[PDB]
Design a protein around this nucleic acid. Sequence first.
RNA 1: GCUACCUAAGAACAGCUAAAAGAGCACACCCGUCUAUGUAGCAAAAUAGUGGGAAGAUUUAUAGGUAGAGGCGACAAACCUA
RNA 2: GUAAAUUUAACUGUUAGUCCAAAGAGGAACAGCUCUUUGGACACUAGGAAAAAACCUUGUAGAGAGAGUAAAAAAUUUAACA
RNA 3: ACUGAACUCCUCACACCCAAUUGGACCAAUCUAUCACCCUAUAGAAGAACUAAUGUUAGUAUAAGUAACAUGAAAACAUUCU
RNA 4: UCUCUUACUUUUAACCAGUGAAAUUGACCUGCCCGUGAAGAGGCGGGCAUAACACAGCAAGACGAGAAGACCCUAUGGAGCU
RNA 5: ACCUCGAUGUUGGAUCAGGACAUCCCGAUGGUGCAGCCGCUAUUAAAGGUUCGUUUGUUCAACGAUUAAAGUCCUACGUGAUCUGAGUUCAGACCGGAGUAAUCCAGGUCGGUUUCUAUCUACUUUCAAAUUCCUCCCUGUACGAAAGGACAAGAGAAAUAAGGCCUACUUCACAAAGCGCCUUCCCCCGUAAAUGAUAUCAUCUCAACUUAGUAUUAUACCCACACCCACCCAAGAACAGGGUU
Lengths: 108, 306, 148, 59, 152
Amino acid sequence: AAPKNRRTIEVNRCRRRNPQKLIKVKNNIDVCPECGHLKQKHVLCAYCYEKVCKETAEIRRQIGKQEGGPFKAPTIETVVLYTGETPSEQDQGKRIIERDRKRPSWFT
Amino acid sequence: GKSGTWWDEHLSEENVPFIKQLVSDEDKAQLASKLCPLKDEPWPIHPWEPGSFRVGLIALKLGMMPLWTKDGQKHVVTLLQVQDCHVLKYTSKENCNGKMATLSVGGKTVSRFRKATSILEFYRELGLPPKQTVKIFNITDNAAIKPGTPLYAAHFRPGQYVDVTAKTIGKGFQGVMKRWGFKGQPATHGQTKTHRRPGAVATGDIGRVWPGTKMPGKMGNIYRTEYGLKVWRINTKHNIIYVNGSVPGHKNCLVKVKDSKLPAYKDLGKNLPFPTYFPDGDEEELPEDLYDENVCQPGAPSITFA
Amino acid sequence: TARGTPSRFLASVLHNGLGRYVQQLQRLSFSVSRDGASSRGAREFVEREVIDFARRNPGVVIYVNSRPCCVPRVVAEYLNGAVREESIHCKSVEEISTLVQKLADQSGLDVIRIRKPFHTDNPSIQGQWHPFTNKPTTFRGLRPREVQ
Amino acid sequence: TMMERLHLFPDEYIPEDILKNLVEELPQPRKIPKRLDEYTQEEIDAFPRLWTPPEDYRL
Amino acid sequence: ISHGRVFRRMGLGPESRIHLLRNLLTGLVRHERIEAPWARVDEMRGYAEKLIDYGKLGDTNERAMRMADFWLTEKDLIPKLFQVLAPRYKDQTGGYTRMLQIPNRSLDRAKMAVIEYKGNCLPPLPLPRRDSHLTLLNQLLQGLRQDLRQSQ
RNA sequence: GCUACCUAAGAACAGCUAAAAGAGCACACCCGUCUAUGUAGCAAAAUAGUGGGAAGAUUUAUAGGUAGAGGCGACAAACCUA
RNA sequence: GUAAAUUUAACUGUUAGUCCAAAGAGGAACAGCUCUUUGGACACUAGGAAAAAACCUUGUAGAGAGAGUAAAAAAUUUAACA
RNA sequence: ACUGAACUCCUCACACCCAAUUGGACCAAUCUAUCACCCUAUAGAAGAACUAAUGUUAGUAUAAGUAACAUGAAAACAUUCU
RNA sequence: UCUCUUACUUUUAACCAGUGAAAUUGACCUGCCCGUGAAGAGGCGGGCAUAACACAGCAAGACGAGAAGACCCUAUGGAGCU
RNA sequence: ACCUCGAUGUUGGAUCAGGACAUCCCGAUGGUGCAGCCGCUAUUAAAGGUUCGUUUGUUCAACGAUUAAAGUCCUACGUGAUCUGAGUUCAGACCGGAGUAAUCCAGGUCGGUUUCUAUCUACUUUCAAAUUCCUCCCUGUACGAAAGGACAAGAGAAAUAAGGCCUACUUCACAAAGCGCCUUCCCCCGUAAAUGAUAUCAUCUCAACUUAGUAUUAUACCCACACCCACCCAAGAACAGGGUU
Ligand SMILES: [Mg+2]
Ligand SMILES: [Mg+2]
Ligand SMILES: [Mg+2]
Ligand SMILES: [Mg+2]
Ligand SMILES: [Mg+2]
Ligand SMILES: [Mg+2]
Ligand SMILES: [Mg+2]
Ligand SMILES: [Mg+2]
Ligand SMILES: [Mg+2]
Ligand SMILES: [Mg+2]
Ligand SMILES: [Mg+2]
Ligand SMILES: [Mg+2]
Ligand SMILES: [Mg+2]
Ligand SMILES: [Mg+2]
Ligand SMILES: [Mg+2]
Ligand SMILES: [Mg+2]
Ligand SMILES: [Mg+2]
Ligand SMILES: [Mg+2]
Ligand SMILES: [Mg+2]
Ligand SMILES: [Mg+2]
Ligand SMILES: [Mg+2]
Ligand SMILES: [Mg+2]
Ligand SMILES: [Mg+2]
Ligand SMILES: [Mg+2]
Ligand SMILES: [Mg+2]
Ligand SMILES: [Mg+2]
Ligand SMILES: [Mg+2]
Ligand SMILES: [Mg+2]
Ligand SMILES: [Mg+2]
Ligand SMILES: [Mg+2]
Ligand SMILES: [Mg+2]
Ligand SMILES: [Mg+2]
Ligand SMILES: [Mg+2]
Ligand SMILES: [Mg+2]
Ligand SMILES: [Mg+2]
Ligand SMILES: [Zn+2]
């Protein structure tokens, strides 16, 4: 199948500029209650998720440092501790991962 | 500008079960308030004339079930359950078409938090929780019923014929073989990429294709009306109707059921309760199950021929 | 073509014929080349006829610039402010005299489509037509099918 | 648009607004040929009797 | 026509779908928090809950041992499953595998999400908090609740 | 340097039945009977399935020779750089 | 009545044509069929028969918001009997 | 009785509506000789004029943001898994 | 294979992100019926229909596209063969 | 030989059919060399239907078993940008024949590439008001001389076509389907007859009029303007739609 005549610019502008093809304005965007970095509703804020993913990567780095090589996977629960912060009397049998930092004021 | 919002966006954690409990007790009390229509202020009840039309109901397709008759054959019944049925508004004869008056009827109950503003104002002036569907029943004016009265499944009696209507099961954009029942081309005798095509669609002279041509396209989400279904059995406790045969639409949809329009069943309506069956003014409780005289009951002597 | 060009209505500039008529041309700017075969007709015109034309109608001002130019021109500015410039490159004396006489005659309105060539300003005298002309009245203004 | 400007009605009844807008009821083209019961008997006396039937005829 | 058809088709067949969910579930049991596309984490949450149920069934049961031997492909996570996760969830029945969306992947712009087992000694996710009780609408509804309870 | 033919000196052909065999089934390999995909394709002739030969008139690497009024040809007027 | 005809010097171009009325020939006293003769039209403008080459009116060129004309619209309705 | 043309009249001016072919009057760009000096004149000359040859070259359109094209999963980005 | 097809998986396909062709194209503000016409009309006559714009299918039409028909004829155009 | 050789793809066949009636049947009427059943012919009527196989490539054609019927024709001898190439239109070869030969045959045979990603028009649920056969009673009656054998009325069963459904059966299983289940409602006009004139009888009336005679001025689906991030769905390509108490 072939074109029989060349489409004009009027037909083309009537096609590629109608409200079915235009980018729709969205209004789900508000500010995050902490740090104000323009989150979306129903979606975790990218800045705070970047914070907790960086700290999770650091904790997993120290965990991989404690577990030698592969296939260890300890049979007891874990807790992490920052500078100071002595092991409490419930955290006896749990494995201790201490990096070196202050405990940040959102991880309780 | 204005963002979108819903009912539980800005509530706290403590207020949501209180709000749910409050509105649930509120509309349950509203549904229990209209339980006695004959002692409120009922519209005048008229006797049955030979040329009249009564209102129908709105039921819910539960499922299907077998049912045997006294002569041994098997019939299949569809369980229609009337959950919460209420007449909504009465439009007089001169305001719709000048021919026949109408009655509005509402279906099963839904949430107030998901309806429009004008619908919520309408039901707030009426005094009922909102309904899922609203259908229109053409009646003559000697059978006008007060809006806000309840409708029950004993509106029909065992031995009658009803017409049921719903949205059928949608099958999407279906090809021409499953839609219009065409035959395709043969499978393996040399055919090249033509196993399910429609083939020719028009002749060679006309240079176009006619408007009524059957082609691919969406199929199955459209109202169809099933006519002349016998009603075998009435269950009064759970408000279940037992029509005969199949009913269009998937289970747990909503159907619109009224007495038949077929000319063979023209004036059989004299022995049916005509404004509507009323649970108050009967002065006698109906049994839990009403049967036709030909359907074999559950507790039965297990028929032996002779 | 008329659809591809602008248009005006027929009108006088400042109601000439009612009171006194005035010559609608102000200036005539002649640029004649000293040497040059392109302006020989304008040369002979400036020699013999422009003085008699200037004495013919004293309302117009005539300038002869006598400038070295390859194409001699005559610039005519009218009373209402329009400017019409036409060329006298390689023309005779008679054609130049006819051109400047035709410039002196016309008024400064634009030479475009004239669009209904009459300009009555009180077109009606006995009273312009309205649909109740030639329609008789009836007793007490009763419409058809009226009761009182 | 010209057909939208036209208002037709099946019987003598016209709505109140369209009766309020009316001017100049137009004459009719045809003459309504005036059946015999309405002939205002002096006119029947004016038109002459053209023929004498025989007295012994039964019709 | 897919009326009532659960289990979206993921891989290059059924077997590759179950192998993909097996690898995602093994990563979840090992790392306790996982980021992966949205349909995959939906299926993997649906499987992980009943995996925790089979872990709750007990260690000596051979059927739970066979299911844990199939679903964990590193063979060290089976003592973890029977001695860490299932004793941790001894009180709860099914409230775990908390799943939240994270905005978009950078390359192909796919809808990503994050699931995690509860407990989870990792730092917490920035969970979406319900609006506070001290705001205007909540205080008006608190007044209404107190007034109606006093009226009752 | 593809292809038709020839020359010099080389290389390859698992396993079973081996009747002795230009023997049989069947690998590697050579060829392309039928079907389906593809037709601006992976490909200016392919892919997948199904096929014939596969110890001999077999296949193939290297170098050389036969050239257009011709070369070559188990004659297809087949091939001689799409 | 008119103003054109003959000759002289110099060349190109047309020379594969259609329809209509009439006299014909072939064919079926068929064809928008073939071939001559006489005339007209087209391959030049405009108006008309519905759009239409060949049917009718009309030719020598423009502006006009004047006028008089040419050709120019299809009419028909019917079976008694001594 | 009327409507109804480029036919005719009316005011003005009048060379200004045919294929192939023929005759005649002008004319842009360029160079040269002589003039001219905000782009012109008189003569000679010619690679002297493009809405069209499936014309050549170069740019950009339509088809069209269409056909088609990719990266196995987790993660400490050490490793592990299918 | 069929009477008589159905369900499932993958590729394909639809939506989001990136890169991003080709044949074709006089201009198109691109409807239907009847009639007409170089004899088969979207562009003509008479009627009918008619707010605008995408997205996904179908192939009845555009005497649709790629090959200056390979069937037939002509050329005082070629060539093979006897 | 009037468009078409800077290409209108050719016969049948598969799917889809539209239309005309000069009607095969189902409907209704006249005549009959119509005693009944079958028949023949004429008028009206196109809403509906018009089978499965063998051989030859066949459209044609011959035969077997059925059915109320296996209708004629047109639609570019309908439809190849939907499909096949069975012969029919090349390059190989064989047989019979013509020709010294190269070559050929409106003679036969074996084999022989079917390319396109839809630009424009038109179209993509018109929501619904079905048809026919068969069985029983009548009846073994009407009818002959006997064979044979009816209409009309009533009752029951199916098949086709359309619209839907999953409770039993089956492919299969939190679904989709048939091999399964349920429903399907009004006519159609050619004539057969009263009274009665032109023409004091008679006469059905392109005389005024009266009956069969008109189904319909037919009823059921669908008809609430804006809460919309997000989730689910028996809803769905995207969009849109239903629920979130
Ligand atoms: Mg099939
Ligand atoms: Mg193919
Ligand atoms: Mg196939
Ligand atoms: Mg995939
Ligand atoms: Mg061998
Ligand atoms: Mg073969
Ligand atoms: Mg072998
Ligand atoms: Mg040979
Ligand atoms: Mg001829
Ligand atoms: Mg003249
Ligand atoms: Mg040139
Ligand atoms: Mg150019
Ligand atoms: Mg081309
Ligand atoms: Mg060109
Ligand atoms: Mg894209
Ligand atoms: Mg496209
Ligand atoms: Mg694609
Ligand atoms: Mg036509
Ligand atoms: Mg065209
Ligand atoms: Mg073509
Ligand atoms: Mg040619
Ligand atoms: Mg010759
Ligand atoms: Mg020659
Ligand atoms: Mg020669
Ligand atoms: Mg030679
Ligand atoms: Mg041709
Ligand atoms: Mg062409
Ligand atoms: Mg007939
Ligand atoms: Mg067959
Ligand atoms: Mg054909
Ligand atoms: Mg076609
Ligand atoms: Mg094809
Ligand atoms: Mg041959
Ligand atoms: Mg489209
Ligand atoms: Mg078009
Ligand atoms: Zn934040």
